[PDB]
Amino acid sequence: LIPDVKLEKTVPRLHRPSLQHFREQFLVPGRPVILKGVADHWPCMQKWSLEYIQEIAGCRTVPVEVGSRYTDEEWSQTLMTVNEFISKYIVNEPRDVGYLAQHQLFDQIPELKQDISIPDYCSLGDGEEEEITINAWFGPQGTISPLHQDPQQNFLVQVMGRKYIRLYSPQESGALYPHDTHHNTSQVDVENPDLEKFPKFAKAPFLSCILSPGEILFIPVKYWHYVRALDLSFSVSFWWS
Ligand SMILES: O=C(O)CCC(=O)C(=O)O
Ligand SMILES: [Mn+2]
């Protein structure tokens, strides 16, 4: 099912905003934004199909997550070839949901680095271009990344399919009942909250969006984010500082 994003506050969308504007209105204040017209002509957008990914990467071994990431004990990873993953969790009637998440596929397969680029906005950071972490997120409809926060800025680029994303600023942490302050994860199920056990969550303000191919979501450092895939999906994240 597709959530109704127009009833919720939508993440603003901007087409190729200037570096200065992005820095002053978004990076410095820590405000989410969607960048349009930047990655939509990346080669990956037209080249990366299920067939092409299976052809180039199908023999390489990757980690595959299964379980709810709400707690360490609730999930685990299995190392398997890309072909095995595609067969078991995408094409054949998947009883369980499997997710090739948070994997540095582009270090494993440098050719794929030719199909993507580093966003120009990353040059506004302090860190170097070499310490930027590029992660692949490839999985079926229905994958869910529970509400959590990360210690770096993020550009999340959608290549294949659509994702529903909810964002809560760092100043809402109280209403999100973190498991452990010291990357931190919420105890709440965004789309099915226990309203007795988590009363403060109902009124917490948030932004939401459906991110589609060619769009980039800027997730400010330590902004809380929740992600559900709406279709067979492939995203590329850029963690930078
Ligand atoms: O795409 C997802 O399922 C989650 C991505 C995420 O947590 C990130 O890019 O930092
Ligand atoms: Mn994250």
Residue numbers in the entry: 174 to 355, 358 to 416
Paper text:
JMJD5 is a JmjC domain-containing protein, present in both the nucleus and the cytoplasm. Building from an extensive peptide-based screen for potential JMJD5 substrates, our results provide evidence that JMJD5 is a JmjC-hydroxylase, catalysing the stereoselective C-3 hydroxylation of arginyl residues in sequences from proteins involved in chromatin stability (RCCD1) and translation (RPS6). Consistent with previous reports, JMJD5 residues 174–416 fold into mixed helical and β-strand topology comprising seven α-helices, 13 β-strands and 3 310 helices. Like most 2OG-oxygenases, the JMJD5 active site contains a metal centre, which is octahedrally coordinated by an HXD..H motif (H321 and D323/βII, H400/βVII), the 2OG oxalyl group and a water molecule, which is likely replaced by a dioxygen during catalysis.
In attempts to crystallise JMJD5, including full-length and N-terminally truncated (aa 153–416 and aa 183–416) constructs, we obtained diffraction quality crystals with JMJD5153-416 and JMJD5183-416, with the latter diffracting to substantially higher resolution (1.1–1.7 Å). We obtained multiple JMJD5 structures in complex with 2OG or the broad-spectrum inhibitor NOG (IC50 6 ± 1.4 µM for JMJD5) in the P3221 (JMJD5153-416) or P212121 (JMJD5183-416) space groups. The 2OG C1-carboxylate also makes hydrogen bonding interactions with the sidechain –NH2 of N327 (βIII). The two methylenes of 2OG are tightly bound in a hydrophobic region formed by the sidechains of W310 (βI), L329 (βIII), and V402 (βVII). The multiple interactions between the 2OG and JMJD5 likely reflect tight co-substrate binding and are consistent with the relatively low Km for 2OG (9.5 µM) and the low level of JMJD5-catalysed substrate-uncoupled turnover of 2OG. In the 2OG complex structures, part of β3–β4 loop is either disordered, or has an 'open' conformation relative to the substrate bound form.
